Amino acid sequence: VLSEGEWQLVLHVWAKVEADVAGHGQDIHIRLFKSHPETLEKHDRFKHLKTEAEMKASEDLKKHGVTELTALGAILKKKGHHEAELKPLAQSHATKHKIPIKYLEFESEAIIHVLHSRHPGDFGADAQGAMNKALELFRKDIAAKYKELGYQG
Ligand code: HEM
Numbered sequence: 001v002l003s004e005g006e007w008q009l010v011l012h013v014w015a016k017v018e019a020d021v022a023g024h025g026q027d028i029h030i031r032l033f034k035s036h037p038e039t040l041e042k043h044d045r046f047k048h049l050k051t052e053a054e055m056k057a058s059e060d061l062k063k064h065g066v067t068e069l070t071a072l073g074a075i076l077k078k079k080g081h082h083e084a085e086l087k088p089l090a091q092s093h094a095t096k097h098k099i100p101i102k103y104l105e106f107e108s109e110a111i112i113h114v115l116h117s118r119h120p121g122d123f124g125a126d127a128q129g130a131m132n133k134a135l136e137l138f139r140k141d142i143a144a145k146y147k148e149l150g151y152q153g
């Protein structure tokens with residue numbers, strides 16, 4: 001369980017994300033797609049963007065990142081009481097997009113790296129530790145939802 005203070009650290013750096021959701025989403029995908037090229041294949045519809053500049057210039061990829069980040073933020077704000085919006089997410093990612101939990105750990109690494117690069121003064125050790133906890137709680141719970149629908153994560 002996260003303590004109240006850890007949820008507050010998570011939501012404090014999240015307010016900084018919400019200052020530029022589109023830019024954060026672009027930077028998280030570029031980082032994810034550079035670190036773990038297998039993960040850009042899964043995003044088959046962006047599979048052909050070759051450079052960071054092309055990635056930034058994609059309004060489609062830009063909107064996609066805002067959609068994912070908006071969904072994650074709504075989850076984080078529930079501070080763990082998030083079953084209701086995990087269910088539709090798990091169903092689409094399990095049965096449609098086919099995303100293993102290790103891809104989710106890859107994306108969490110990219111989130112933590114982008115949040116650190118962009119807001120170090122608002123994202124130090126206690127905060128990164130609280131965000132790692134939040135995202136692993138998200139991974140744990142959705143892994144469970146995966147199983148409930150069949151097919152492992
Ligand atoms: C914080 C974790 C994530 C959240 C909250 C997020 C959420 C979303 C949402 C809300 C959508 C739009 C509706 C959908 O089709 O169900 C979406 C689509 C998608 N997501 Fe995720 N996602 C996450 C991580 C990932 C990861 C790790 C991958 C693959 C490495 C991924 C791949 C996809 C793909 C391929 C689609 C469809 C994109 C298309 O429309 O071109 N998702 N995701």
Ligand SMILES: [Fe+2]
Pocket residue numbers: 029043064065068
């Ligand atoms: Fe994505």
